[PDB]
Design an enzyme around this catalytic site. Structure first.
Site, PDB file in Angstrom:
ATOM      1  N   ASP B 383       0.836  -1.184   0.000  1.00 34.00           N
ATOM      2  CA  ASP B 383       0.000   0.000   0.000  1.00 34.00           C
ATOM      3  C   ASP B 383       0.883   1.251   0.000  1.00 34.00           C
ATOM      4  OD1 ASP B 383      -2.337   1.844   0.914  1.00 34.00           O
ATOM      5  OD2 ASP B 383      -0.963   1.857   2.619  1.00 34.00           O
ATOM      6  N   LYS B 384       0.328   2.362  -0.481  1.00 32.92           N
ATOM      7  CA  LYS B 384       1.128   3.575  -0.606  1.00 32.92           C
ATOM      8  C   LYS B 384       1.004   4.499   0.606  1.00 32.92           C
ATOM      9  CE  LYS B 384      -0.338   7.069  -3.134  1.00 32.92           C
ATOM     10  NZ  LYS B 384      -0.358   8.010  -1.988  1.00 32.92           N
ATOM     11  N   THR B 385      -0.199   4.999   0.875  1.00 29.18           N
ATOM     12  CA  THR B 385      -0.385   6.059   1.859  1.00 29.18           C
ATOM     13  C   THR B 385      -0.311   5.488   3.269  1.00 29.18           C
ATOM     14  OG1 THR B 385      -1.821   7.159   0.261  1.00 29.18           O
ATOM     15  CG2 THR B 385      -1.827   7.997   2.520  1.00 29.18           C
ATOM     16  N   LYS B 519      -7.352  -5.331  -4.731  1.00 26.69           N
ATOM     17  CA  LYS B 519      -6.004  -5.669  -4.284  1.00 26.69           C
ATOM     18  C   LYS B 519      -5.878  -7.163  -4.014  1.00 26.69           C
ATOM     19  CE  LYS B 519      -5.510  -1.144  -2.103  1.00 26.69           C
ATOM     20  NZ  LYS B 519      -4.854  -0.549  -0.912  1.00 26.69           N
ATOM     21  N   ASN B 543      -8.676  -0.870   4.410  1.00 24.80           N
ATOM     22  CA  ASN B 543      -8.867  -1.268   3.023  1.00 24.80           C
ATOM     23  C   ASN B 543      -7.761  -2.185   2.513  1.00 24.80           C
ATOM     24  OD1 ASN B 543      -7.265   1.270   3.188  1.00 24.80           O
ATOM     25  ND2 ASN B 543      -7.118   0.999   0.972  1.00 24.80           N
ATOM     26  N   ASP B 544      -6.726  -2.430   3.312  1.00 28.08           N
ATOM     27  CA  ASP B 544      -5.682  -3.389   2.985  1.00 28.08           C
ATOM     28  C   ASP B 544      -5.933  -4.758   3.597  1.00 28.08           C
ATOM     29  OD1 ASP B 544      -4.066  -1.420   1.574  1.00 28.08           O
ATOM     30  OD2 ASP B 544      -3.641  -0.584   3.554  1.00 28.08           O
TER      31      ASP B 544
END
Ligand SMILES: CCCCCCCC/C=C/CCCCCCCC(=O)OC[C@H](COP(=O)(O)OCC[N+](C)(C)C)OC(=O)CCCCCCC/C=C/CCCCCCCC
Ligand SMILES: *[C@@H]1O[C@H](CO)[C@@H](O[C@@H]2O[C@H](CO)[C@@H](O)[C@H](O)[C@H]2NC(C)=O)[C@H](O)[C@H]1NC(C)=O
Ligand SMILES: *[C@@H]1O[C@H](CO)[C@@H](O)[C@H](O)[C@H]1NC(C)=O
Ligand code: ALF
Lengths: 324, 815
Positions: B383-385, B519, B543-544
């Site tokens: 994940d990025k943020t 994902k 959300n991950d």
């Protein structure tokens, strides 16, 4: 913050040895230089042992003992002729050997009551179920119970040296000191119910293949009942279907004469034990001992071979390392 | 199309608002869990062996086969039940939360799970939406509300939603007495950015209006009302049918590559055991076809054995051989694996390199069953943020560089927008100035016909006709939906397959504007590739969770987005940079330790049992054990148990400092290398050779009248004791030769196992034991030790057995 201990941080002091070709190559030479002389010593020691084996089964018609395979008169006797080409000098050991006899069969091995054989009063009158169908006979317990006891080897073997005047000189044999000390003195014990043995076995019966009861195995009170050494030697079951059991000891004389001088000998055989029903064979073995035991070239040959292979491989690797 | 009445008023029957993430209830937990556990071949075999030992025959007690099986089953059941109870607690927290319902012109305080479809829900500022709502009105006169959806896309930016224009004036009690309307909307679906609907506001004019609804009118479950005092909405989708619930998948059981290898090895050894038993039974009944071979005069059967049916006796003899040789499948290995997995997991939680001063927390271990999987990773989905960024995290670029040097592929899966995601990828140096970007987005594609052209062009004229670092892939959520929903009814010209082909030889892949289920779908697509790559996903948000549960090992980050990712992960770390230490050192060590433990267990038990199998050819195939029952019992309990456990908990074949500074060493154990066919065959043939050497060296030693100077004779128990002594010393010294990291604990266990074997032999064979029914080992060991030739034979056999290992050591460390 976590605990900064050596165990918890996976930083315990360690040795960390390194094993490389350059640091392990000398072991392939040290092992050879240790194994080869030891192997030669074992091989030479085994070659100096004097041994003779005489088969007296009597399966061939030309045998002095075919008349004993299926006898008519109960006590069948046979004498066999053999020659000692070289004198036996030290302590001599007399063995009997049995082929094709499975003392290591699972049903055979468990057929004993070790509490009874250790002199336990309750087990004497109530032998275990594991020693069946040799557990009870004529509504009485069998004092040594089980198949191992019931099948005890019972041939009588005596030796005579043929003298210069054709008169046979009997060789004296000792029946004591043939069993393990600890199983004669601890593992095998007699019932404690008094001092006379015939009374201490009051409510028991002999094995079905026994001729005389267990308290008539010997007149010597220290070799009479469960502590009879022939009985103990039989009861220590063998590892392989072909085996040997120590029978008698021929002790060296106080003088420097040979224990068994070279010459002509007789083998008095009282043939009581049948083996031809299951295709077994009966042998008598006379042998000398050493620090290594009896005659066996396996250990010396194997030590020599392993040492030589180790040395040769070490030389090959050393020559490889020096190609540069 | 589902029809929803705004106040459940006339102008269907849906599910309730209760969410479930657990798989067990209280009443069915034991049946379901025991059925799942005993559906596994290892547990079924152990149960069958225990039952046979109880009912038919056994060389030792049935206790030593039943107690370890019970222990393993109970430990697994406790772990699974505790995890499901945690899921129950989370579900109870999500439900049972206070919600307000406009029921009859009045605010009614209800429970979250009690919301029906079609009732007016009132949500205040900073409150999470309990279900999927159509915005009817707000306090403001413009009918506009602001929403944060960090639990759905991982972003903290405010999103603007609009109420129905004909209902913006409905506030207070005007939302019930002046609101008769019906909503026709689609069936629930996980798109998260697509909603089709229509509302019919009926009034007293008999001329009902119709207004179309879009995603701007839909307040999703899990989003938060921001900067808006109060809103009014109507439930259109309720729990298990909201988009948040449809983007949740639930965790399937996670099994390590080492566990799968254990299963394969167990199958091979089960075949070996069955073959040995069948050979022994066939040869036994060939042998017994001689009437003096079976029942000679000196070894007679009882009446019961003679009157026992022949077929039943054949079956019973096969079972007896099975239990005689069953040790080659050791349940002690499973017990030791459980113990090592539990104890070794504490190093992650103790590691001071994972401690973060900002949150005053270190690493967290949720599952101890995946320690070895940390050393087998192939793909990293990040994940990025909040994971790569805070401005990047402290050593994000350096961690990505180390992961690349370890041979791993790093893909970014983000619910954020393309431009910011791409800028982060350039900052992290996933994309360089030399990387050429292939863009499967809404800008480059406007219809599904152009998508296939783009896929074909990136296949056949750009990338395969080529420079691996030359290309990077960017795809957004809508195009991925097109790929995953338009590639059906085909197997050869699979556009999903073409997309995966493009992805596999790109230097990096960026998937932006992702939904939570997408994902997990990407991770699943990678998991289904040829060669079965091991997948790791890492993130900090709720959300991950779907991709964290989907991957082989999921990593949660303890950040500001809550603890849903951490609570659902297998391992949790404060920072993304901790992944380098977690994989390169901890995972490498865990994999090597457990792989060596598995191979050693199988090897040592084959070394144990093969001489016993060979002994059947020299008894009457009578199932006579070669060793004493006490030796059989404590071979795996007391003689050879602790050294391998200490090895699997302390061994550093490479130092941790070296493992951290050299990511390239990760590739040595890359594809389950230590448990492949080559190493397995090496261990198996070494065990077979050593067992043959044991038995036949002892056999040829016993080809003599006496091994002693007193001329006395040894028997079957001494034979077995010599074989057992050579075996114990050989396996212990093999482990010692394998050892590279000698602590005082390793010295203690390794040398004290041999010292205790000697001490126990003397003690057990020292006293006529008054509580057993036999005295078969009274002075066997003591008498054997009085033979110089026996000592020499034992030493020679030990050296011969370890010779291939020593030769391999000298060969592999030259040139
Ligand atoms: C001096 C320094 C060096 C050391 C010198 C040596 C000194 C002696 C010390 C050693 C003891 C260390 C113990 C380590 C573990 C070894 C035992 C083990 O691990 O080996 C399992 C063993 C043997 O198995 P085997 O392969 O020989 O097969 C059995 C054979 N056959 C199938 C044919 C019947 O079997 C068993 O007797 C089971 C024993 C293992 C524990 C499992 C049973 C526990 C009971 C269950 C209760 C349920 C608990 C559930 C969880 C509760 C929450 C906490
Ligand atoms: C020597 O041993 C043999 C073998 O056990 C004994 O033979 C058994 O004798 C009993 C009693 O007469 C018979 O019922 C068995 O049938 C015999 N078995 C066999 C295989 O022949 C023999 O009696 C013993 N002789 C002695 C003690 O001098
Ligand atoms: C065994 O006993 C005598 C004793 O001298 C021996 O000479 C003979 O050869 C043997 N057989 C018999 C009983 O004649
Ligand atoms: F923080 Al994200 F995908 F959830 F970048």
């Amino acid at each position: 913050r976590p605990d900064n201990t050596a165990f918890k941080q996976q930083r315990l002091p360690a040795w960390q040895p390194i094993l490389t070709a350059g640091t392990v190559l000398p072991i392939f030479f040290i092992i050879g230089l240790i194994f080869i002389p030891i192997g030669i010593g074992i091989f030479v020691t085994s070659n100096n042992i004097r041994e003779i084996e005489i088969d007296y089964t009597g399966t061939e018609p030309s045998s002095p003992c075919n008349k004993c395979l299926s006898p008519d008169v109960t006590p069948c006797f046979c004498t066999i002729n053999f020659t000692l080409e070289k004198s036996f000098e030290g302590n001599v050991f007399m063995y009997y050997g049995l082929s094709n006899f499975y003392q290591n069969h699972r049903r055979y091995v468990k057929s004993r009551d070790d509490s009874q054989l250790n002199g336990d009063s309750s087990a004497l009158l109530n032998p275990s179920k594991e020693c069946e169908p040799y557990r009870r006979n004529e509504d009485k317990p069998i004092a040594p119970c089980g198949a191992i006891m019931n099948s005890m080897f019972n041939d009588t073997l005596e030796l005579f040296l043929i003298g210069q005047d054709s008169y046979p000189i009997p060789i004296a044999l000792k029946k004591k000191g043939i069993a393990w000390w600890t199983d004669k003195n601890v593992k095998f014990r007699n019932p404690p119910g008094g001092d006379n043995l015939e009374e201490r076995f009051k409510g028991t019966t002999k094995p079905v293949n026994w001729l005389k009861p267990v308290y008539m195995l010997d007149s010597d009170p220290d070799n009479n009942g469960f502590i009879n050494e022939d009985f103990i030697v039989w009861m220590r079951t063998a590892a392989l279907p072909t085996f040997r059991k120590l029978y008698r000891l021929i002790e060296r004389k106080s003088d420097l004469h040979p224990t068994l001088p070279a010459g002509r000998y007789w083998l008095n055989v009282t043939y009581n034990y049948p083996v031809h029903y299951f295709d077994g064979r009966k042998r008598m073995i006379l042998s000398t001992i050493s620090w290594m035991g009896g005659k066996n070239p396996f250990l010396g040959i194997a030590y020599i071979a392993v040492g030589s292979i180790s040395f040769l491989l070490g030389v090959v690797l050393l020559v490889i390392n020096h190609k540069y | 199309t589902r029809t929803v009445f705004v106040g459940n008023h006339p102008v269907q029957r849906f599910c309730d608002n209760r969410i479930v993430s657990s798989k067990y209830t209280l009443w069915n937990f034991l049946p379901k869990n025991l059925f799942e556990q005993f559906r596994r071949i290892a547990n079924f075999y152990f149960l069958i062996i225990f039952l046979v030992e109880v009912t038919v025959d056994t060389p030792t007690s049935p206790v030593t086969s039943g107690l370890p099986l019970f222990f393993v089953i109970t430990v697994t059941a406790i772990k699974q039940g505790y995890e499901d109870w945690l899921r129950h607690r989370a579900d109870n927290e999500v439900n049972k939360s206070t919600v307000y319902i406009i029921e009859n012109a009045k605010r009614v305080r209800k429970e979250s799970e009690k919301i029906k479809v079609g009732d007016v829900v009132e949500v205040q500022a900073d409150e999470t939406f309990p279900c999927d709502l159509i915005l009817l009105s707000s306090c403001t006169t413009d009918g506009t509300c602001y929403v944060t959806t960090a639990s759905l896309d991982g972003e903290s930016n405010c999103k603007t939603h609009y109420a129905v224009r004909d209902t913006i004036a409905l506030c207070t009690a005007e939302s019930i007495d002046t609101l008769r309307a019906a909503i026709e909307c689609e069936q629930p679906q996980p798109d998260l950015y697509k909603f089709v609907g229509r509302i019919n506001i009926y009034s007293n004019s008999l001329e009902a209006v119709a207004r179309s609804l879009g995603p701007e009118n839909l307040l999703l479950k899990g989003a938060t009302l921001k900067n808006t005092e109060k809103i009014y909405g109507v439930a259109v989708y309720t729990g298990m049918e909201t988009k948040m619930a449809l983007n949740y998948q639930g965790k399937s059981q996670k099994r390590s590559a080492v566990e799968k290898s254990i299963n394969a090895f167990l199958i091979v050894y089960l075949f070996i055991l069955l073959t040995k038993a069948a050979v022994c039974t066939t040869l036994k009944y060939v042998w017994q076809s001689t009437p003096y071979n079976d029942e000679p005069w000196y070894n007679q059967k009882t009446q019961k054995e003679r009157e026992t049916l022949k077929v039943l006796k054949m079956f019973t003899d096969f079972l007896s051989f099975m239990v005689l040789f069953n040790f080659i499948i050791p349940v002690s290995m499973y017990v030791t694996v459980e113990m090592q997995k539990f104890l070794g997991s504490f190093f992650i939680s103790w590691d001071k390199d994972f401690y973060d001063e900002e949150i005053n927390e270190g690493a967290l271990v949720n599952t101890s069953d995946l320690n070895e999987e940390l050393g087998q990773v192939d793909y990293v989905f990040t994940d990025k943020t909040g994971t790569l960024t805070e401005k990047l995290q402290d050593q994000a670029a350096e961690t990505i560089e180390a992961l690349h040097a370890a041979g791993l592929k790093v893909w970014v899966l983000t619910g954020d927008k393309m431009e910011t995601a791409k800028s982060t990828c350039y900052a992290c140096r996933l994309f360089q100035t030399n990387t050429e970007l292939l863009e499967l987005t809404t800008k480059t594609i406007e219809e599904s016909e152009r998508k296939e052209d783009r896929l074909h062009e990136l296949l056949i004229e750009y990338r395969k006709k080529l420079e691996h670092q030359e290309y990077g892939l960017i795809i957004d959520g809508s195009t991925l939906s097109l790929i995953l929903n338009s590639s059906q009814d085909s197997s050869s010209n699979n556009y999903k397959s073409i997309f995966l082909q493009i992805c596999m030889k790109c230097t990096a892949v960026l998937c932006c504007r992702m939904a939570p289920l997408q994902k997990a779908q990407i991770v699943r697509m990678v998991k289904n590739l040829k060669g079965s790559p091991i997948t790791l996903s890492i993130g900090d948000g709720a959300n991950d969770v779907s991709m964290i549960l989907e991957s082989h090992v999921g990593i949660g980050i303890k950040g500001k987005e809550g603890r849903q990712a951490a609570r659902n992960s297998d391992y949790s770390v404060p920072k993304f940079k901790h992944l380098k230490k977690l994989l390169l050192a901890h995972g490498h060590l865990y994999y090597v330790r457990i792989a060596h433990l598995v191979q050693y267990f199988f090897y040592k038990n084959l070394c144990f049992i093969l001489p016993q199998f060979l002994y059947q050819f020299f008894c009457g195939f009578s199932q006579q054990p070669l060793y004493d029952a006490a030796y059989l019992t404590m071979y795996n309990i007391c003689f050879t148990s602790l050294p391998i456990l200490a090895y699997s908990l302390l061994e550093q074949h490479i130092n941790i400092d070296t493992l951290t500074s050299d990511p390239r060493l990760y590739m040595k154990i890359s594809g389950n290398a230590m448990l492949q066919l080559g190493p397995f065959l090496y261990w198996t043939f070494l065990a077979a050779f050593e067992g043959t050497v044991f038995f036949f060296g002892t056999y040829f030693l016993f080809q003599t009248a006496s091994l002693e100077e007193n001329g006395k004779v040894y028997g079957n128990w001494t034979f077995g004791t010599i074989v057992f002594t050579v075996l114990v010393f050989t396996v212990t010294l093999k482990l010692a030769l394998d050892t590279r990291f000698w602590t005082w604990i390793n010295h203690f266990v390794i040398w004290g196992s041999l010292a205790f074997y000697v001490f126990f032999s003397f003690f057990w064979g020292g006293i006529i034991w008054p509580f057993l029914k036999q005295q078969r080992m009274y002075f066997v060991f003591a008498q054997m030790l009085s033979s110089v030739s026996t000592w020499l034979a034992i030493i020679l056999l030990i050296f011969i057995s370890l010779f291939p290992e020593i030769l391999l050591i000298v060969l592999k460390n030259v040139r």
